[PDB]
Scaffold this active site. Structure first.
Site, mmCIF file in Angstrom:
data_model
loop_
_atom_site.group_PDB
_atom_site.id
_atom_site.type_symbol
_atom_site.label_atom_id
_atom_site.label_comp_id
_atom_site.label_asym_id
_atom_site.label_seq_id
_atom_site.Cartn_x
_atom_site.Cartn_y
_atom_site.Cartn_z
ATOM 1 N N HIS A 58 -2.841 91.825 39.701
ATOM 2 C CA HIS A 58 -3.537 93.138 39.614
ATOM 3 C C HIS A 58 -5.044 92.943 39.761
ATOM 4 C CE1 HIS A 58 0.325 94.863 38.133
ATOM 5 N NE2 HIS A 58 -0.092 95.794 38.985
ATOM 6 N N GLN A 97 15.025 91.469 42.309
ATOM 7 C CA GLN A 97 14.349 91.972 43.532
ATOM 8 C C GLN A 97 15.279 92.895 44.321
ATOM 9 O OE1 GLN A 97 10.811 91.508 44.819
ATOM 10 N NE2 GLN A 97 11.252 91.833 42.647
#
Ligand code: JJF
Ligand code: MG
Ligand code: ZN
Length: 313
Positions: free
Chosen positions: A68, A269
């Protein structure tokens, strides 16, 4: 006003494709962002002195976290740039201004932790903003940087244009809270299929802008496999950190964030591409047909994860 940013020939061509990777040279990212502003918006949209000082204050307020980070900010801005270029006539002068800046600011001062971790930690921000906790903080930080002396890149908009642009940026940044994406996309799904989607209806545009933000924000899943694969490490480095911190609060973390359960990642995923990414870019492609390359990249990467599970890599 005659000073263009120009990029090396490979970047000049590749930047226009959705799957562009901005590369490992940090010192080139501000110039890449400005280049994208000049071609998306105009050389007149922002005073270059002010924009450069805004960009550098934004960069300084991103932290050194595995995912991030400043690189995420510019990556997400590039995906918005691609969407905006491939949909020239659909977006107003303000919307093109606001949305590239919204993308660059959308994760300002991120610590690498989810809204859930802040609530279980009892972080002061969770008392200040009961929902979309980090996302309300990112908009706050965006407004703070805009109000630094010499940083108001919007200073030549009219009172009401300025209020319009900050309203676009606020919704844009709130919409990156993935808790809000599910309901947002369901609604756009119904609207599109019963034919009632209406791009002159402001509440509709808002929903469409929100889906574009989810699309840009998740665009790691739309790159070529090597880039997607290597970014997933950064994404999971943050998740495992948070899982570690849950365990220190005497809370078992969800398996996604438990670093003891790395084996379960390929399956994790799959559910993510099936439950979030694929639906996101499908509905985006239905509303904005020229964004289909994102859906095709995403499906390609879903296929690559299937191969990992079958032991073929
Ligand atoms: C699991 C996961 N994988 C991603 C892969 C690429 C980009 C973003 C991603 N975000 C993810 N999270 C965010 C909130 C739930 C799961
Ligand atoms: Mg975020
Ligand atoms: Zn983000």
């Amino acid at each position: 006003g005659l000073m263009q940013f120009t990029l090396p020939v490979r970047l000049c061509k590749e930047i226009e494709l959705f799957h562009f990777d901005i590369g490992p040279f940090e010192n080139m990212w501000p110039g890449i962002f400005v280049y994208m502003v000049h071609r998306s918006c105009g050389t007149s949209c922002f005073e270059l002195e002010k924009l450069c000082r805004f960009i550098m204050s934004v960069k300084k307020n991103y932290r050194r976290v595995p995912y991030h980070n400043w690189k995420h900010a510019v990556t997400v801005a590039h995906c918005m740039y691609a969407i905006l270029q491939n949909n020239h006539t659909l977006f107003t002068d303000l919307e093109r201004k606001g949305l590239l800046i919204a993308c660059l600011c959308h994760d300002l001062d991120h610590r690498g932790f989810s809204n859930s971790y802040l609530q279980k930690f009892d972080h002061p921000l969770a008392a200040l903003y009961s929902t979309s906790t980090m996302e309300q903080h990112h908009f706050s930080q965006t407004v703070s940087i805009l109000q630094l002396e010499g940083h108001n890149i919007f200073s030549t908009l009219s009172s009401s244009e300025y209020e319009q642009v900050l309203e676009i940026i606020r919704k844009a940044i709130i919409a990156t809270d993935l808790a809000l994406y599910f309901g947002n996309r369901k609604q756009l799904e119904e609207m599109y299929q019963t034919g009632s989607l209406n791009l002159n209806n402001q509440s509709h545009r808002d929903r469409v802008i929100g889906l574009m933000m989810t699309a840009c924000d998740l665009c790691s899943v739309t790159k070529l496999w090597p880039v997607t694969k290597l970014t997933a490490n950064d994404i999971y480095a943050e998740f495992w950190a948070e899982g570690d911190e849950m365990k220190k609060l005497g809370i078992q973390p969800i398996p996604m964030m438990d670093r003891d359960k790395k084996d379960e990642v390929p399956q994790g995923q799959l559910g993510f591409y099936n439950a979030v990414a694929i639906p996101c870019y499908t509905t985006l492609t239905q509303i904005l047909p020229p964004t289909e390359p994102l859906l095709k990249a995403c499906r390609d990467n879903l296929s690559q994860w299937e191969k990992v599970i079958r032991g073929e890599e």
